[PDB]
Design a protein around this ligand. Structure first.
Ligand SMILES: OC[C@@H]1[C@@H]2CC[C@@H](C2)N1c1ncnc2[nH]ccc12
Length: 167
């Protein structure tokens, strides 16, 4: 039993809700919140910019130190950093940017990072400025993640469409 509320069950282990991941994080304070990051951990907009703003830029300060030490992430890769005031930890995951020419097959690799954590609050990956159709992303999530994932879907029309879709 956990403190997530109002989620619609999609499979044994995947749950979905029309919600802003930032507000879900502030309310639930989960163990792991997933950020939809780029390889430079430059949190400008979308999920990343909104999460970072909610941390008063502390996420960006921590991220810049991480990059200065370790260099950029791989597309499809991840790192665990602090969750600041939003969660115990933040799992920064890089989905492929199809508008950068990056291989959509790397979306499966990106979701594989979720399997290292028993429970996560997460957005759909690659479905923002990275291009990728959200229907495909939800499908990859369901077919890749085996741990318990609570998906926060920002756009209501998109959520309704995802819920009403079989294939
Ligand atoms: O696929 C991620 C989606 C789409 C790309 C950016 C938006 C729409 N995003 C969000 N999802 C969940 N909580 C969010 N809070 C702020 C943005 C946001």
């Amino acid at each position: 039993v956990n403190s997530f509320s109002g989620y619609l069950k999609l499979t044994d282990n995947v749950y979905i809700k029309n919600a802003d991941i930032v507000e879900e994080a502030k309310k639930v304070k989960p163990t792991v919140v997933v950020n939809a990051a780029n390889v430079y951990l430059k949190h400008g907009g979308g999920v990343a910019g909104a999460l970072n703003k909610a941390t008063n830029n502390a996420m960006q300060v921590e991220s810049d130190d991480y990059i200065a030490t370790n260099g950029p992430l791989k597309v499809g890769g991840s790192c665990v950093l602090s969750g600041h005031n939003l969660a115990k930890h933040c799992l920064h995951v890089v989905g492929p940017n199809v508008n950068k020419g990056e291989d959509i097959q790397l979306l499966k690799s990106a979701y594989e990072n979720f399997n290292q954590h028993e429970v996560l609050l997460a957005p759909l990956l690659s479905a923002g400025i990275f291009g990728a159709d959200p229907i495909h992303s939800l499908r990859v999530c369901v077919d890749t993640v085996r741990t318990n994932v609570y998906l926060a879907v920002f756009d209501k029309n998109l959520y309704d469409k995802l819920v009403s879709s079989f294939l």
